[PDB]
Design a protein around this ligand. Structure first.
Ligand SMILES: *[C@@H]1O[C@H](CO)[C@@H](O[C@@H]2O[C@H](CO)[C@@H](O)[C@H](O)[C@H]2NC(C)=O)[C@H](O)[C@H]1NC(C)=O
Ligand SMILES: *[C@@H]1O[C@H](CO)[C@@H](O)[C@H](O)[C@H]1NC(C)=O
Ligand SMILES: *[C@@H]1O[C@H](CO)[C@@H](O)[C@H](O)[C@H]1NC(C)=O
Ligand SMILES: *[C@@H]1O[C@H](CO)[C@@H](O)[C@H](O)[C@H]1NC(C)=O
Lengths: 108, 168, 51, 168, 168
């Protein structure tokens, strides 16, 4: 009829709504977890290992390197970590012709 | 054990992962077993660090640009890029699924073992009543209680003291 | 931007401490490996069963 | 458990993976425990689907053709093709070996747990006789039987009824 | 079990991995259970062979040399070489970590099972005294001893012989 002195063994619980998947079960809510997948960017063209890139505006590598009159980028840079070009620059080889080994120069 | 014979978890225990709940003449309390908890915390952390830190990457520019007379190289390069994504996506997805099951199984085996510790000391000086609950056949003080926890529990000091209330 | 990174994506920079990313396949830097996955979460604790 | 203390399997049980065999005054029967069976069926299916469905492939033409003055590219391309085959062949062979052992271990732990369920309800109202066989110290009807199965078994309703034949 | 309830290992047992230590009127001895030992030796060997032999490699020259106007190909090739090293280094490091834990867990489950064998035969004809130590309530000869080992132990032939010293 009565309940004397007791010791109960058990486990922790909390307000966590985190869910994981196992090889045997889906959508298992858990106390503590860790995300391994980066799904978010800052939306900015940052510096790389302390060095800024070379923004070319409306110029292509060709336009900038040949010195197309619409390309100048004022008092210019002397080191860059990578290059920033627009999907379709509008200022390149203003006088038509073939640029030899262009993809090679771009890489170098 | 976890969602098995011990149906749920304690929102009352905030000092650990696995532990105990005692009630006596002095009062009731939630106490986490700091030895099984720490070894589980350290162990899991190690698993996680291994998954993250083992991935070491050097500086690399993935992209390659080709001309209209370099379609084979362009495709060779796509084959590389895609083959690596295929491998990492499969491996990563499967590793997480496998070791998440392993982690969950590991906790279960720790609570089943924490239970067996208490069952081993309190041979017939207590009764298996609820889930992971044990019902003392003797008067277990805030002293005897905190002694079941650190495993230094004295079976004889309460062996005969239990026998009286036992046969009844 | 004036920000500093270890990993640059065409749409913005990424936190390189994690082993994987699903942002962009073509990156520049010390980058997490690109994966097609939507979630990659490792359980540390116990199943949350509080009722 | 599997090929362990329970030596073999029942060709008589066709309704599940793990179950029971009862014999009483009414008759004998093979009944699969539909709860442990279903959770095992669902779980394994998940493991399998994960192994198959996680492998997603886009449209690709592996082959590349080179000229007599493109032997380096030809070989670069062989290096790619072979490196990927080496990885998939090793990973695939090893994953199957590892998770086949894991599957087999999982069934074993389910039968050992199904046994412990029955042992937990029938504390000393029965005797451990054979492999996974329990010998009732009381008259267990087609009613009490089907009650050990769904875990709603009434220990007191047969507690004293056992005691008589027990001491003998 | 391993570094658990059975605290340490025997430098005295040199004939196997898991076994027993008996002491009686005849004398004391260290004897390895050659059935659990062999199945563990064969099993682990298989795991190892699978890790080594599954790695089959054909004849290949990794290196490729390019000219000053082939920087893209040079880098494409570096991307391949590095991508494969990244995969193998991660996979290999993680496989070893995972299956080393699995091996260690496997030994533990074998000693816990070897214990339960002995506990199953010697129901109450002996007492659980130390770690994996059992204290006979009867006179167990070099004959009865070597019979607990091969599992052909005769419970009745010593059942009543124990009862006398038992109640005392
Ligand atoms: C640099 O790019 C600009 C922008 O595309 C070019 O300007 C165009 O020039 C044509 C000339 O017939 C005009 O009709 C358009 O209105 C201009 N576009 C814009 C948006 O202003 C220009 O040709 C390029 N300059 C060089 C030297 O390459
Ligand atoms: C996961 O389960 C929770 C309830 O436990 C529910 O709210 C949620 O919608 C589920 N998610 C999916 C995708 O099934
Ligand atoms: C590029 O061209 C657009 C118009 O097409 C103009 O608004 C912009 O200021 C130009 N310069 C740069 C540096 O983008
Ligand atoms: C980067 O990621 C790690 C792990 O996800 C996190 O601890 C850290 O705060 C993150 N930092 C930033 C700036 O996002």
């Amino acid at each position: 009829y009565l309940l004397e002195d007791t010791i109960c063994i058990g486990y922790h619980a909390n307000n966590s709504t985190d869910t994981v998947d196992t090889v045997l079960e889906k959508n298992v809510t858990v106390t503590h977890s860790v995300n391994l997948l980066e799904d978010s960017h800052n939306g900015k063209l940052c510096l790389l290992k302390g060095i800024a890139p070379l923004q070319l505006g409306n110029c292509s590598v060709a336009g900038w390197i040949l010195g197309n009159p619409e390309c100048e980028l004022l008092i210019s840079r002397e080191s860059w970590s990578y290059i920033v070009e627009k999907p379709n620059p509008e200022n390149g080889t203003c006088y038509p012709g073939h640029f030899a080994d262009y993809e090679e120069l771009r890489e170098q | 054990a976890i969602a098995g014979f011990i149906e749920g978890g304690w929102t009352g225990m905030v000092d650990g992962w696995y532990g105990y709940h005692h009630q006596n003449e002095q009062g009731s309390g939630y106490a986490a077993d700091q030895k099984s908890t720490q070894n589980a915390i350290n162990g899991i952390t190690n698993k996680v660090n291994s998954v993250i830190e083992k991935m070491n990457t050097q500086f690399t520019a993935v992209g390659k640009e080709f001309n209209k007379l370099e379609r084979r190289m362009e495709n060779l390069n796509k084959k590389v890029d895609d083959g690596f994504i295929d491998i990492w996506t499969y491996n990563a997805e499967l590793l997480v699924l496998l070791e998440n099951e392993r982690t969950l199984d590991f906790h279960d085996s720790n609570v089943k073992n924490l239970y067996e510790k208490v069952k081993s000391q309190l041979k017939n000086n207590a009764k298996e009543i609820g889930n992971g609950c044990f019902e003392f056949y003797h008067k277990c003080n805030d002293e005897c209680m905190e002694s079941v926890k650190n495993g230094t529990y004295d079976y004889p000091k309460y062996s005969e003291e239990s026998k009286l209330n036992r046969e009844k | 931007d004036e920000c500093d990174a270890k990993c640059q994506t065409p749409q913005g920079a990424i936190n390189s401490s994690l082993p994987f990313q699903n942002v962009h396949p073509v990156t520049i830097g010390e980058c997490p490996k690109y994966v097609r996955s939507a979630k990659l979460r490792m359980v540390t604790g116990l199943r949350n069963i509080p009722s």
